[PDB]
Amino acid sequence: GTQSKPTPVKPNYALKFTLAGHTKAVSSVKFSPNGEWLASSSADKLIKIWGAYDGKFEKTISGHKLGISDVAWSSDSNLLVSASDDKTLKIWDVSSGKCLKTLKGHSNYVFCCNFNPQSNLIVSGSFDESVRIWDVKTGKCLKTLPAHSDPVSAVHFNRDGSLIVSSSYDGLCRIWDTASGQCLKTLIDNPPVSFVKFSPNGKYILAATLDNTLKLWDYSKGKCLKTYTGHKNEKYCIFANFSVTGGKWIVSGSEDNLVYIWNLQTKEIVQKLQGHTDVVISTACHPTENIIASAALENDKTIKLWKSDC
Ligand SMILES: Cc1cccc(C(=O)Nc2cc(-c3ccc4c(c3)CCO4)ccc2N2CCN(C)CC2)c1
Ligand SMILES: [Cl-]
């Protein structure tokens, strides 16, 4: 555009590939940190690996005895961890597909998992209301945090692994010191907190609550900076993201089968992506390219890859 009448930055995500193969609801999609792969987890008890740029099916990883709610990559893209209804997490060698460790400790469904950036630790969240911290090398549980008084919906390490953020159906978001296991901040108001993650910087958290609201928090200050609405979220633990490769967006799934994209600053809905035929429970943003992956529930069972110019 021009200096006097500038072109507003609005994304133009368009559907590129639909990835079919899971035989039940898909729970989670994650891009490998090296940008090459997408991993998906499903109620079909399987993990599948796909080409990030071409949607090509790569491999099926099996071993869990019940449905899988989450999958996460190690920082060098060599390992995966998965969280399952069978009360365990498993660590997987990406190359061979083999189960390297089974992480035993949780007393009920495991819903969420992540490696720390150093990738010597895994954090998990469970229906059993605990957050657990595990040694990657040994598969041993190092700490059981008495984290919440209701199911844990999300767990995330910050950029240097020194903090963990957790969210729960108890209505709280908590910030934990990785080393000590101590709670350093509680955000409290509240409906169930269905999702949380740290900003790419680490200075902010983004939290979803089951009142159709996403909020951007300055956690240390305890001040809510932004609110994002216009989507439907009153039931499912829907995964949202910071999109920072091009323009600065917030991306989320929705119970009206759409992917919503907001301008992070203006809180305005800049795009709504149509195509899925059930609740979009998971979104992921590619580490380097303007690529969104989205995944949907039982009436859909597919992953979609969307590409933008900004
Ligand atoms: C096997 C499978 C397939 C499709 C969806 C789900 C599911 O909805 N997961 C789940 C359930 C609950 C959950 C919460 C409360 C509760 C239940 C489940 C049953 C009774 O009360 C909380 C979190 C999650 N996660 C977190 C990770 N995310 C990437 C996905 C969704 C699971
Ligand atoms: Cl993530």
Q: Rounded distance, CA 292 to CA 171, Å?
A: 28
Q: Which among 86, 111, 282 is the best mutation to test ligand 1's pocket, defined by most ligand atoms within 8 Å of the CB?
A: 111
Query: Would you say the CB of residue 94 lies under 6 angstroms from ligand 1?
Result: no
The answer to whether residues 133 and 142 touch, using CB atoms and an 8 Å cutoff, is yes
Distances 179 to 89, 117, 121, 124, 239 between C-alpha atoms, Å: 21, 14, 11, 15, 26
The candidate with the shortest Cα–Cα distance to 44, out of 256, 279, 297, is: 297
The candidate with the shortest Cα–Cα distance to 175, out of 189, 190, 162, is: 162
The residues spanned by each domain of the chain are 1-310
DSSP H or E segment with residue 260: strand 259-263
Report CA(110)–ligand 1 centroid distance (Å): 9
Q: Rounded distance, CA 29 to CA 32, Å?
A: 10
Q: Rounded distance, CA 93 to CA 91, Å?
A: 7
DSSP labels, 33-95 = TTSSEEEEEETTSEEEEEETTT--EEEEEE--SS-EEEEEE-TTSSEEEEEETTS-EEEEETT
**3-state secondary structure (DSSP) of residue 217:** strand
Query: Would you say the CB of residue 253 lies under 6 angstroms from ligand 1?
Result: no
Strands 57-62 and 152-157, bridge-based pairing: unpaired
- Residue 136: Cβ within 10 Å count: 20
> Which residues have C-beta within 8 Å of that of residue 85, sequence separation ≥ 6?
64, 66, 67, 68, 69, 109, 110
CATH superfamily, region 1-310: YVTN repeat-like/Quinoprotein amine dehydrogenase (2.130.10.10)
* Approach to solving: X-ray
Report CA(53)–ligand 1 centroid distance (Å): 28
Greatest Cα-to-Cα distance within the chain, rounded to the nearest angstrom: 62
310 alpha-carbon distance from chain centroid: 22
Q: Rounded distance, CA 240 to CA 214, Å?
A: 9
Query: Would you say the CB of residue 233 lies under 6 angstroms from ligand 1?
Result: no
Residue whose pair of structure tokens reads 């020194």 in the numeric block: 162
Q: Rounded distance, CA 147 to CA 5, Å?
A: 51
- Residue 139: Cβ within 10 Å count: 17
Q: Rounded distance, CA 207 to CA 230, Å?
A: 15
> Which residues have C-beta within 8 Å of that of residue 197, sequence separation ≥ 6?
154, 156, 165, 205, 206, 240, 241, 242
| Rounded to 5°, angle at Cα 153 from 151 and 155 | 120
Rg of the Cα atoms in the chain: 18
Q: Rounded distance, CA 190 to CA 172, Å?
A: 8
The candidate with the shortest Cα–Cα distance to 303, out of 13, 43, 33, 39, is: 39
**3-state secondary structure (DSSP) of residue 224:** strand
Q: Rounded distance, CA 155 to CA 61, Å?
A: 23
The answer to whether residues 163 and 179 touch, using CB atoms and an 8 Å cutoff, is no
Report CA(30)–ligand 2 centroid distance (Å): 7
The candidate with the shortest Cα–Cα distance to 94, out of 82, 102, 103, is: 82
Q: What is the distance between the terminal CA atoms of the chain, rounded to a whole angstrom? A: 15
Query: Would you say the CB of residue 112 lies under 6 angstroms from ligand 1?
Result: yes
